[model samples]
Target chain A: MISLIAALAVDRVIGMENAMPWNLPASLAWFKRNTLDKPVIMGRHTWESIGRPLPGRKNIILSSQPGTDDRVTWVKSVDEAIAACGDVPEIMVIGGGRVYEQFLPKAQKLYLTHIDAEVEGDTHFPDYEPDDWESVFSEFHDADAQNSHSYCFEILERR
Target chain B: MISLIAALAVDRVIGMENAMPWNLPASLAWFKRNTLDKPVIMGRHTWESIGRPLPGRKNIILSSQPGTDDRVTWVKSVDEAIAACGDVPEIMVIGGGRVYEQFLPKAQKLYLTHIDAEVEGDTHFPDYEPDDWESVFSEFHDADAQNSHSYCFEILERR
Candidate 1:
């Protein structure tokens, strides 16, 4: 299974200055918990933005110039990353805007956090037709002192 | 206070063929319950789309043609309609796309239903900067036998 995950602020922005504009510890934790043991594929820009290998997961970077790390594998394309996943039950497409757009059509499942606030940014998520997916789950969360904005977590499956 | 209300399909479209594309009884009830007895302002096109006076509410129309009806007061502009509200604590801006755009800057609150389905349409909701508003309430509902699409009701207040 291929699962794509992202948090899009109200205007569909995914990043600003190559980093998420808001800090939501809970949403980060949710991402970690779900992708911990999966092979996570990402664009080189996304990996650079994160600045380090994610622990307890196979960090696969899609890049042309092969980079090596005991915890990371560099590949030239999404297909190469998926092949590297081998027998893993699922592969997670963690993102920058470009990576998300690349895998959107091929991914079978989507885990999206719709943040209720908008921020000025240079990166954005690609638009998807709503009728092409079935929303299997949705959970709303309120903004607390820890979270700067209210948001909703939604799980969608291609219909 | 002024509450601006509309239902946006997944593509952000608000109307097709001069009417809402989906027939959601509960959402209509929700609209009626909130606007009942409050003076409701709408554009001439919206008034024509609705066809008759909304029961238990003062139907105020923004129009230039000097139309008359026992149940409605026709005004020449949004300013005139707001003036018609006079000392009333709150008024509702029921809409067509253009009217929503006209009052968006002045609206103190928004009653938006985000329908989880896309429909082909010629009319759409005007884009409002999300950062200008703070989401105060949200409730998600699934599609059942009666409702054809899952949707969410959200209330936002100008920050």
Candidate 2:
């Protein structure tokens, strides 16, 4: 199964300047919990933002050039990334815009945290019809000291 | 006090082809319950979309052109609309994009139904940073017989 995880704004704004616009500790933990122990696929920008391969997950970066690091596998295509995650229970599509769009169509489940705040962003999560999905789980979290913005966590499966 | 109300998509898409892209009975009832007996302000497009003036509320439409009908009070500007609702507890800014933008800056509260859909749209609700508003109330509703798509009802007050 291919599962996508992203924290986007009400306007579907996922990123600004190669990084998330808002900081939410609760969502960060939520991200870690879900994608931890999975073969996570992401774009080079997201890889550059982290500056290192995430621990406990098999990191796959979609890149055209060769990498000197042995920590993560550099794949040029979505097929290569999916092939790399062979036999895994679920493949985590952790993103930057291009990465999410590439994998969105084939992905079975979506882990989306829709933040309430509207922010400017150059990158956005790709559009999907809500009527085409089944809401498996939905939870709303109010802003707190830890999470600076209020958001909702929705787990959706393709209908 | 001015309260903006609309059922928009994940990308702030409010209208497609001068009408709501989706039918939502739950949100329509909710809209009625809140705007009932109040002076509801809107643009000419939204007024035309409804075809007739709303029954209970004082329908105030903002239009530069003359309104021959006696059912709605056609105003020239946002100021004129505000002035027309003197002593009314709250003015509901029902939308069509332009009217929402005109009133958003001064609107104290927003009754927003963030529908979990990704649809093509030509018109959009204006942006307001979620951080600037406090989520007074938020309730998520699943897709049911009455509502075709899953959506969240959010009542936010400017901080």
Chain B TM, per prediction = 0.93, 0.96
| Chain A TM-score vs. truth, each candidate | 0.92, 0.94
Q: What is candidate 1's lDDT per residue for B15-105, written digit by digit as tens? A: 6553343446668888998899899999887777666999999999887787867678989888898999989988899887888888887
Overall lDDT per candidate, in order of appearance: 0.80, 0.82
lDDT of 1 at A16: 35
For candidate 2, give fnat to 2 decimals: 0.00
User: What is candidate 2's lDDT per residue for A1-159, written digit by digit as tens?
Assistant: 999999888789876333443446678789999988889998876776667889999999897888758889989987888898889889999887888889889989999998886766677799989888898999998775345468899999999
DockQ score of each predicted structure, in the order shown: 0.01, 0.01
Per-residue lDDT tens digits for candidate 2, residues B5-109, read 988887899876523334466788999999999999888877776778998999998999999688789899888889999897888999878888888889899
Estimate the Cα RMSD of every predicted model relative to the unseen true structure.
17.4, 17.7
Off by over 4 Å in 1: A1-159
Return the lDDT, model 1, position B37: 84
Candidate 1 chain B lowest-lDDT run of ten? B16-25
